[PDB]
């Protein structure tokens, strides 16, 4: 039923941020937030 679970997950409209990755030569971590004009920056997700 994992397939049914993912089907019911994908039934909903979705949005994504895309990233293109370039080597840096170290151990980097990114902190990503959304900035609205009429609000304060709010953290989104975690990545490195």
Partner 1 sequence: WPENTFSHTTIIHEEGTTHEETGEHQELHVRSDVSSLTREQVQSLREA
Partner 2 sequence: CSVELFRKKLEPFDRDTNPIELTRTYSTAKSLFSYRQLGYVYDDLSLN
Query: What residues make contact with partner 2 under the rule CB under 8 A?
Result: 8, 11-13
Q: Give the total of residues touching partner 1 (CB under 8 A).
A: 20
Task: Draw the binding track, 5-44, toward partner 1 (x: CB under 8 A; -: no contact).
Answer: --xx-xxxxxxxxxxxxx-x---x-x-x------------
The β-bridge partners of 40 are none
- Report what 21 binds from partner 1, partner 2, none; CB cut-off 5-8 Å by kind: partner 1
Cα–Cα distance measured from residue 38 to residue 32, given in angstroms and rounded to the nearest whole number: 18
C-beta of residue 32 within 8 angstroms of C-beta of residue 44: yes
């Amino acid at each position: 039923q994992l397939d049914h679970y993912i089907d019911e997950r994908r039934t909903k409209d979705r949005t994504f941020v895309g990233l293109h990755l370039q080597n840096i030569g170290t151990s980097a971590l990114v902190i990503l937030s959304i900035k609205p004009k009429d609000g304060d920056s709010y953290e989104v997700a975690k990545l490195a």
